[PDB]
């Protein structure tokens, strides 16, 4: 495995501030380092800093940053379904309930590109798609999307329909749900999903439409009607 420190080649860079300018671990640079020690070491199913020191590193992030770190947790191991799930269940049972969304994201990314006949992701998310807190439901939906990318399984769309009708879900959750429903039926023009998104967008209000997070609904419409 490659180390993010090696990838950045900090030895070669002109360290004008030596030993004092790199001791600050902000949330943003932590997220960047997680994304690096993810993508870089991704698909090898191994890492010398993420599989063993995942939780301590994760705790240093806040809200979104910790979510992304948890997702990268499994992002390390792509295409290894059983091993990835075994290595990610411990964080799925993390102390902070907010880590669970990132754990679901990591589980979906591990399963991303690989389909198992018994489909663990749907079973995991069946009792969590209605979960009241937005972030954990978002993590479950994204895990489903990555693991089940392009599945077009009618069960997932039917379950998401209550998600579409769940006004309790937040705007970010709504955008994630639209993206997931589009990814399920990428390039298919799903009639049921088509009608659902149509009704959602007409039912949408201008006051709650002016927001910057309302730009994903056409994303889902196109994804369903892509190509």
């Amino acid at each position: 495995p490659k180390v993010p420190d090696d990838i950045y080649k900090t030895h070669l860079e002109n360290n004008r501030f030596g030993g004092s300018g790199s001791q600050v671990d902000s949330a943003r640079m932590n997220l960047a380092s997680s994304f690096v020690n993810g993508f870089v070491n991704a698909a090898f199913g191994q890492d010398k800093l993420l599989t063993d020191d995942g939780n301590k590193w994760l705790y240093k992030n806040k809200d979104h940053g910790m979510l992304s770190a948890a997702a990268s947790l499994g992002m390390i191991l792509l295409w290894d379904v059983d091993g990835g799930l075994t290595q990610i269940d411990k964080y799925l049972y993390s102390s902070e309930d907010y880590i669970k969304s990132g754990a679901l994201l990591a589980c979906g990314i591990v399963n991303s590109g690989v389909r198992n006949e018994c489909d663990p992701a749907l079973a995991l998310l069946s009792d969590y798609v209605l979960h009241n807190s937005n972030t954990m439901r978002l993590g479950s939906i994204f895990g489903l999307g990555l693991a089940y990318a392009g599945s077009n399984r009618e069960d997932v769309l039917t379950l998401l329909l209550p998600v579409m009708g769940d006004s309790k879900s937040s705007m970010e959750v709504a955008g994630v749900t639209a993206l997931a429903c589009g990814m399920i039926a990428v390039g298919s023009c799903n009639g049921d999903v088509t009608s659902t998104i149509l009704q959602t967008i007409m039912e949408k209000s201008e006051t709650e439409l002016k927001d910057t997070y309302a730009r994903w609904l056409p994303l889902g419409l196109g994804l369903n009607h892509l190509g």
Binding site: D82, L85, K90, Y93, S95, N116, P120, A123, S126
Partner: protein, 95 residues
């Protein structure tokens, strides 16, 4: 048929065994008995494996009939670094 389930289980690649295995069991038993029989038939820890049945997770306190187990139903073999109850308790202690 007589309330029995021919559930097919998916063992992890770590255990060098058949990926798809057919398991014969009754329906009046609970998830704990399901995992115990999985251990007896395929040699894997009962409490260290998580099984998803019929697009749903295992219910240790619920019987097979009410937990979704059916004929030829699929099921993961989710090896857990910690037992579900043990994992819960230990990671709640580690907070």
């Amino acid at each position: 048929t007589t309330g029995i389930a021919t559930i097919e289980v998916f063992l992890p690649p770590r255990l060098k065994k058949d990926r798809k295995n057919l398991l014969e069991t009754r329906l009046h038993i609970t998830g704990r008995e399901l995992r115990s029989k999985i251990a007896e038939t395929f040699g894997l820890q009962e409490n260290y494996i998580k099984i998803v049945i019929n697009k749903k997770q295992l219910q240790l306190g619920k019987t097979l009939e009410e937990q979704g187990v059916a004929h030829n139903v699929k099921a993961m073999v989710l090896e857990l670094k910690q037992s579900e109850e043990d994992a819960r308790k230990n990671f709640q202690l580690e907070e």
